[PDB]
Design a binder for this molecule. Sequence first.
Ligand SMILES: C[C@@H](CP(=O)(O)[C@@H](C)N)C(=O)O
Ligand SMILES: C[C@H](N)P(=O)(O)C[C@H](C)C(=O)O
Ligand SMILES: [Cl-]
Ligand SMILES: [Zn+2]
Ligand SMILES: [Zn+2]
Lengths: 188, 188
Amino acid sequence: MNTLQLINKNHPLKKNQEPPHLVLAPFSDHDVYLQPEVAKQWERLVRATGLEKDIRLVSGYRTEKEQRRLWEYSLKENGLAYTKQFVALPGCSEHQIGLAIDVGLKKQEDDDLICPHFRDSAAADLFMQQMMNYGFILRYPEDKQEITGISYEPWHFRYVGLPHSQVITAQKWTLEEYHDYLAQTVRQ
Amino acid sequence: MNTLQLINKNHPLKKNQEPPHLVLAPFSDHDVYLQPEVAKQWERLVRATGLEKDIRLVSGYRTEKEQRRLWEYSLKENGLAYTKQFVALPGCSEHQIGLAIDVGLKKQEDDDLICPHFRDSAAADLFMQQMMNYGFILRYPEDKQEITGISYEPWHFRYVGLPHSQVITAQKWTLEEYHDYLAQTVRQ
Ligand SMILES: C[C@@H](CP(=O)(O)[C@@H](C)N)C(=O)O
Ligand SMILES: C[C@H](N)P(=O)(O)C[C@H](C)C(=O)O
Ligand SMILES: [Cl-]
Ligand SMILES: [Zn+2]
Ligand SMILES: [Zn+2]
């Protein structure tokens, strides 16, 4: 189980890839499932930031079939442009390996399917200060769209574990750039 | 597509069972998947009742592994007796075939994933007046626990389609009793 696995349009999942072990993750108002270490660190993060009343887990594990239904729904409802921007192709979603969390605010009207609100908020600010100390990175940062192939998603966090999350966040890297960095270092 | 399939402790899913067709379902704050006709009738029901801003889809299709992890979670958090009251055994949940919905109120903060709040509100009252006209039944009514093997769940609805849901609801039947009725009637 590689917590650093790069999954995107250029690196899709293999169909022989073992489905992740899963557990039900806490701090949601519905059933969300995550790889066990991810759930454990998510829980540690929420408790340590004391954000129990302020944030919630919106989305976790999705099967490929589910990712395809999500994709097809957004394509139909929101059009190809929006969908390519904000939804990963089936086979290319981190949600399919149980290492991705979508996080939202608990006091939200509007709250949308594809783009849960995790912006303009003291809680989100605190979450962004401590996330990396529990193994999470902001997967799709602003102005990295050409590197990640995905538009800015303040709600989507990827578990990579320590110290990777701290290294990545401090350098304001994407996971793509992190792999580039590691490959360049073994190359030198 | 057997919309009347009886799934419970005494009638588990087989792995003769091909997985359900699935679509992303509307009127939720996260990704919920349902069999297509279920999602369609759910959407019609919410629009007809004008409850788009009042209720939400909490849970839909759940894989067998997910049901197992949900059950294991409840065991840890709530103990065995509570879990058996409210959570179907893995392999015995209607959620695994995509014909069940858990419904909650859209305004509820820190809602319970196991037992979503769905009583003492005008929204729930109106939903209970119209659900059966769109193919849904209250799966686990309050005075039927010896028949269903499950405690009263005001939030849990099962799609059986028309006219079945109207027949079942007018008789204050369970799906168990409905099956016994159809069986008994055939022998006439
Ligand atoms: C790129 C992400 C989009 P998301 O899952 O955060 C959004 C659909 N909720 C993915 O599809 O894996
Ligand atoms: C977990 C909730 N109590 P449910 O999903 O409404 C219970 C139902 C019997 C099932 O586990 O399918
Ligand atoms: Cl399908
Ligand atoms: Zn996501
Ligand atoms: Zn249910």
